[PDB]
Amino acid sequence: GTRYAGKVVVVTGGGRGIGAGIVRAFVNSGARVVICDKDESGGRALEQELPGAVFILCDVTQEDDVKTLVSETIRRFGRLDCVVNNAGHHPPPQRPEETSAQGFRQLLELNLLGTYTLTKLALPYLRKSQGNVINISSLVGAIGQAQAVPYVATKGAVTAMTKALALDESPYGVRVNCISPGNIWTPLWEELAALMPDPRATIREGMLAQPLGRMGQPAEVGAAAVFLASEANFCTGIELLVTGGAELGYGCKPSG
Amino acid sequence: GTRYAGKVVVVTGGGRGIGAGIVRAFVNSGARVVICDKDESGGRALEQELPGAVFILCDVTQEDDVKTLVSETIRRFGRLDCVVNNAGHHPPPQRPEETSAQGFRQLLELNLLGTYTLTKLALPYLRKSQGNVINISSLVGAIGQAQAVPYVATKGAVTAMTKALALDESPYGVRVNCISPGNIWTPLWEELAALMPDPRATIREGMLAQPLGRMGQPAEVGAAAVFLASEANFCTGIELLVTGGAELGYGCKPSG
Amino acid sequence: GTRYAGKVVVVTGGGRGIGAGIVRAFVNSGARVVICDKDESGGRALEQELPGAVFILCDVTQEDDVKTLVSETIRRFGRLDCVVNNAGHHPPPQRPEETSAQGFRQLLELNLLGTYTLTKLALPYLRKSQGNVINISSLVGAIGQAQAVPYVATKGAVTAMTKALALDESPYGVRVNCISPGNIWTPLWEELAALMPDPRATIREGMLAQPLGRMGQPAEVGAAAVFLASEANFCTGIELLVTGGAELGYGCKPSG
Amino acid sequence: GTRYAGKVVVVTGGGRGIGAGIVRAFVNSGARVVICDKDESGGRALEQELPGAVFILCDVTQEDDVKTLVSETIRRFGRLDCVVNNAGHHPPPQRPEETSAQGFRQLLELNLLGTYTLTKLALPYLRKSQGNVINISSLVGAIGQAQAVPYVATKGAVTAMTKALALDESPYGVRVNCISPGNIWTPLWEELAALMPDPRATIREGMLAQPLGRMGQPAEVGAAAVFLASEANFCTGIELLVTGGAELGYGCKPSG
Ligand SMILES: NC(=O)c1ccc[n+]([C@@H]2O[C@H](COP(=O)([O-])OP(=O)(O)OC[C@H]3O[C@@H](n4cnc5c(N)ncnc54)[C@H](O)[C@@H]3O)[C@@H](O)[C@H]2O)c1
Ligand SMILES: NC(=O)c1ccc[n+]([C@@H]2O[C@H](COP(=O)([O-])OP(=O)(O)OC[C@H]3O[C@@H](n4cnc5c(N)ncnc54)[C@H](O)[C@@H]3O)[C@@H](O)[C@H]2O)c1
Ligand SMILES: NC(=O)c1ccc[n+]([C@@H]2O[C@H](COP(=O)([O-])OP(=O)(O)OC[C@H]3O[C@@H](n4cnc5c(N)ncnc54)[C@H](O)[C@@H]3O)[C@@H](O)[C@H]2O)c1
Ligand SMILES: NC(=O)c1ccc[n+]([C@@H]2O[C@H](COP(=O)([O-])OP(=O)(O)OC[C@H]3O[C@@H](n4cnc5c(N)ncnc54)[C@H](O)[C@@H]3O)[C@@H](O)[C@H]2O)c1
Numbered sequence A, B, C, D: 001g002t003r004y005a006g007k008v009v010v011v012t013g014g015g016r017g018i019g020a021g022i023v024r025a026f027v028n029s030g031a032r033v034v035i036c037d038k039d040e041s042g043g044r045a046l047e048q049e050l051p052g053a054v055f056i057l058c059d060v061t062q063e064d065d066v067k068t069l070v071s072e073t074i075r076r077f078g079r080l081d082c083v084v085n086n087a088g089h090h091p092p093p094q095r096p097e098e099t100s101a102q103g104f105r106q107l108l109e110l111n112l113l114g115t116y117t118l119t120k121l122a123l124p125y126l127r128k129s130q131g132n133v134i135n136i137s138s139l140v141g142a143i144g145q146a147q148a149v150p151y152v153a154t155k156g157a158v159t160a161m162t163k164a165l166a167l168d169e170s171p172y173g174v175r176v177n178c179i180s181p182g183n184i185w186t187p188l189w190e191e192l193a194a195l196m197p198d199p200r201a202t203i204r205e206g207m208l209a210q211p212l213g214r215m216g217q218p219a220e221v222g223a224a225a226v227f228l229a230s231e232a233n234f235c236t237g238i239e240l241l242v243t244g245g246a247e248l249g250y251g252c253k254p255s256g
């Protein structure tokens, strides 16, 4: 591909799931890609699989990991054009009274501050390249979700932060956007479903929450990321919904 | 009541349903209320029932009816402080291919242009009184609805128009706001349900579309209108949702 | 290009401005494009310029023009994969009291019902092809604009209609999306500015309404349309903002 | 007043500014009010001033302070009907590169986790009383703000959390809503302005960011809170904008 040829992209949590889909999309568009992940298994295999992708072990909650990720990217490829902040986690369903402040802090540390820290360290290089930032948020930041107060809160923060940063970085020509996926079939979706009393029913329900009648694919999020990086040159501070229409209309959720 | 004492309010479609609830709320707050409706039966009874409410027969799609409504209101009460554009209609469910341009035009004529025409004729008086406009839109203007392309379109227009007009009238101190109800139990809701194969099931489904587990009441929309008129003095161009949370979260509406 | 190779696209108002940018984007992506426009001058030249684009004279407010547009497209190319409803108009600034119901109706006829009519006639063919609809709305439908009550209302309607139709057509695999541009430098923008007391100042103000410090280009809207057609396969009922960030933050628009 | 007679309300950060306005609104509506604040000066005076208001020293970032606040409220008044999470802080303008992860964490601790902790400890009592939660968020959580990445992020989180919690608590009849003010003239606004090179200009600019041409008052936020507590019985998970229209239209913030 040539849509993003000559560009260098860092994808956090790129070892599996949505992140791996985004990695593949950017490789297919001609970019060189750095796969950041805290686990080795998926990302190492992906590096072997994909010419133009390399793997760097990095836990985005560890500031020295992230500093090394940025400096290794520059040392090896000489520029940085796009950072995709995809690393994140959805805890199992938890009733509000079953949550804790400390668990909330830990989830904020990954879903929000990990995105903040890489963005901050990358911005000097993105400014030189007139590059861009893509944050992977969630539809449920906008519309809410049951049994997920901490998670919903972290994604509300990511989406809002995206707009703040877009404002700050617009004078430098650096665009900052986010993608808000809905149900995307990933290993995390599979893991969460396996915890439920009836996994198969949870998966059917998840497929049917969308007017389109299926969950989304990592490749579909990847395509949206490539669009934001390579062609959305008048888009900054937007929230691109990749949800199959889940937010549309009424569903199951006289006046007394 | 004294929250809106000494004020004069016009409520279109005030003979039944949401409009009658709004009429009652304003009377209870101390205002004098003009009940506008194209049908006599409900509004005439309401005038007899409520001291401080009077009924004026007026079809908001007929410009001379509306001109007379405004001039009779001023002749009888000497001022005009609030116009509530509630008159409107939801056609039966219709698939897109079952709609027509002419039916769409007719629905626009009521739901949108009727609101426009009264607002336009009232604004000289609202400017003198630093009064305000309240448009009754719908949640489905924001989130969509199935088998209702014309209706959804008219309410998307009302909500957007509310913001445009708020901008234009802000220099004059005239606030313009809208209320977007969700399922409110009214005669129109009952009529629509009676068309369905199973009315009781349609009503149960409608009650359950809300996290709160019931439909809303006309009095609850009425209370929101009184708030916007009497106490929301720093609110203009807002969309106040009165929906029981229907827009929140996923509902019923693997990656292949 | 090959992103949308073998596909057939109809672009209304494709003779100049945003529509011509969209035409060019789709041609560059490998599609065959039908340029619909009520004026001959731009579209005829564009047909001569672009292999793979042809021009059909058609006024989208004339139902028989639109019926012929669809049947000629099928007769000449054998399928229809995407309809881009771009034709529309922004009247000069008008204070609310300077508007009329009949001017409002005429603007609704173009900006809203023209989009409705082509969509309706195209949908049988889009269903066979699992094609998609792209409506060109406006940011000001969402956030409002001064001295433009009718225009704002028409675009609020288009955006809402997009969501309604997405719901109705999702069972058939037909996606329905809209693009909401902000200030895009087009002949209409130039014409409107030329009416102002100071055209150059109006244009400078328009450039600065965006954090990015410039207006957008037709090609940038075109790229977003190609993305929605060719790669956004899990997107339906979305509003894709192409605005340069104009909706972000505070601007020029103690407690007494 | 009698709108909220017999009810017990806790207002955090009630010693001055918006919180004190909310305290006064609830007292005027007939409620008994607990003023929570980390500083004694304003709240102690307010307790002396207002029959029906009492002051409890409490730092919402200190879990044992908050536990004692709830148990003292129940011991002294026998019930709890509404919690208003108003305590929060806006740091001085800070460019993204001038922020730190640790400052971000500290701001999250106040603006987000303080709201979480009181809500969590109050919910058993709110469930018994079918009470409600009101969170004071900010417009800039929704639209962004320049030189305020941490602040914007915290308020995006509060607004999203409000919707999540509304979903979780709806089966228990507990409503959870938020108010998103824009520029409200408060001591914090005055303090921030005094840091600027030209305070008077910053204040003029702040007044003019609103179509209404002034900043809002604490009493106006207070009225909106009383409405949400006492009359918005079909509202849950909403974001009530109290902004003077700042989010409407274009402002100051050719295609090359
Ligand atoms: N799957 C969905 O339906 C869905 C929906 C909306 C949003 N999202 C978001 O998309 C993102 C990816 O989700 P997914 O479903 O692909 O999850 P996943 O669990 O399948 O994959 C996430 C990847 O990130 C890595 N990761 C986790 N913590 C990390 C850390 N500290 N440092 C580096 N890498 C780390 C994991 O090792 C893994 O390879 C997350 O931000 C999630 O919130 C997912
Ligand atoms: N009921 C709901 O669930 C619901 C939900 C969202 C929005 N709404 C909106 O609320 C409004 C009232 O709805 P409702 O459910 O109370 O309906 P309703 O049918 O029960 O009452 C509407 C009233 O308006 C009158 N009316 C109709 N056309 C008129 C005209 N041309 N001139 C004057 N009066 C006219 C009717 O005669 C009637 O008295 C409408 O704008 C509707 O779109 C209703
Ligand atoms: N230019 C902007 O800043 C801007 C911003 C937001 C939205 N938009 C929307 O984008 C669309 C295109 O705007 P533009 O700026 O390119 O305008 P334009 O005037 O430059 O071009 C519009 C084209 O549509 C054609 N057209 C008009 N009426 C028609 C009809 N009845 N049938 C067929 N063709 C018809 C015109 O002849 C012209 O070729 C419109 O829907 C407009 O509302 C424009
Ligand atoms: N003023 C505005 O324009 C504005 C706009 C939008 C949102 N807000 C929000 O409204 C709320 C109040 O703002 P304000 O302008 O009135 O501020 P303020 O500084 O004038 O008052 C805040 C009050 O909260 C108290 N407080 C601070 N930290 C506390 C803690 N840890 N525990 C207990 N009390 C604490 C302070 O002592 C003070 O009395 C905040 O959440 C703020 O983000 C304000």
Ligand SMILES: O=C(c1ccc(F)c(O)c1)c1cccc(-c2cccc(O)c2F)n1
Binding pocket: A015, A016, A041, A042, A043, A045
């Ligand atoms: O056979 C693999 C595979 C990889 C990607 C594909 F698209 C595919 O079709 C297959 C493979 C091999 C080694 C490790 C992992 C792995 C990936 C992701 C996460 C993990 O934990 C892993 F162990 N996969």
Ligand SMILES: O=C(c1ccc(F)c(O)c1)c1cccc(-c2cccc(O)c2F)n1
Binding pocket: A090, A091, A092, A093, A094, A137, A138, A139, A140, A145, A146, A147, A148, A181, A182, A183, A184, A188, A189, A192, A193
């Ligand atoms: O990873 C999930 C997710 C799904 C949608 C998103 F928008 C998102 O950001 C994340 C997910 C997967 C399986 C079940 C649930 C779930 C359902 C229902 C309630 C819950 O608490 C759940 F966690 N979530």
Ligand SMILES: O=C(c1ccc(F)c(O)c1)c1cccc(-c2cccc(O)c2F)n1
Binding pocket: B015, B016, B041, B042, B043, B045
């Ligand atoms: O007995 C009535 C009534 C009216 C309002 C009430 F709240 C109530 O408890 C009862 C009544 C009497 C005459 C006409 C109508 C009427 C109203 C509304 C619409 C109509 O079509 C009507 F005929 N009602």
Ligand SMILES: O=C(c1ccc(F)c(O)c1)c1cccc(-c2cccc(O)c2F)n1
Binding pocket: B090, B091, B092, B093, B094, B137, B138, B139, B140, B145, B146, B147, B148, B181, B182, B183, B184, B188, B189, B192, B193
């Ligand atoms: O009057 C209705 C309505 C309900 C919610 C709103 F937000 C609103 O503005 C209007 C209504 C009543 C009964 C069934 C349906 C319906 C359901 C499902 C599909 C439909 O096409 C329906 F008409 N609607």
Ligand SMILES: O=C(c1ccc(F)c(O)c1)c1cccc(-c2cccc(O)c2F)n1
Binding pocket: C015, C016, C041, C042, C043, C045
């Ligand atoms: O020289 C032209 C041109 C056309 C497109 C280009 F990108 C370009 O660089 C140049 C041209 C020639 C004839 C008619 C029109 C025309 C187009 C659009 C609208 C009109 O009214 C027209 F007369 N243009």
Ligand SMILES: O=C(c1ccc(F)c(O)c1)c1cccc(-c2cccc(O)c2F)n1
Binding pocket: C090, C091, C092, C093, C094, C137, C138, C139, C140, C145, C146, C147, C148, C181, C182, C183, C184, C188, C189, C192, C193
């Ligand atoms: O064509 C315009 C437009 C610009 C933005 C959009 F989002 C849109 O859909 C349309 C436009 C061009 C020049 C001036 C004005 C204008 C400014 C200020 C006030 C007005 O009434 C204006 F017409 N508008």
Ligand SMILES: O=C(c1ccc(F)c(O)c1)c1cccc(-c2cccc(O)c2F)n1
Binding pocket: D015, D016, D041, D042, D043, D045
């Ligand atoms: O004279 C006061 C006052 C209080 C409220 C009013 F509405 C009023 O018109 C006046 C006063 C007295 C003691 C402490 C504080 C105080 C309040 C709020 C914050 C503080 O830091 C304070 F010292 N005020």
Ligand SMILES: O=C(c1ccc(F)c(O)c1)c1cccc(-c2cccc(O)c2F)n1
Binding pocket: D090, D091, D092, D093, D094, D137, D138, D139, D140, D145, D146, D147, D148, D181, D182, D183, D184, D188, D189, D192, D193
């Ligand atoms: O307390 C503020 C605030 C104002 C609006 C809100 F919606 C809100 O939640 C908070 C405030 C006060 C004075 C200046 C600034 C400011 C302006 C411009 C840029 C900034 O970084 C600022 F802090 N803010």
Ligand code: NA
Binding pocket: A046, A047, A048, A049, A050, A051, A052, A053, A054
């Ligand atoms: Na490789």
Ligand code: NA
Binding pocket: B046, B047, B048, B049, B050, B051, B052, B053, B054
């Ligand atoms: Na009477």
Ligand code: NA
Binding pocket: C046, C047, C048, C049, C050, C051, C052, C053, C054
């Ligand atoms: Na050609």
Ligand code: NA
Binding pocket: D046, D047, D048, D049, D050, D051, D052, D053, D054
């Ligand atoms: Na007291």
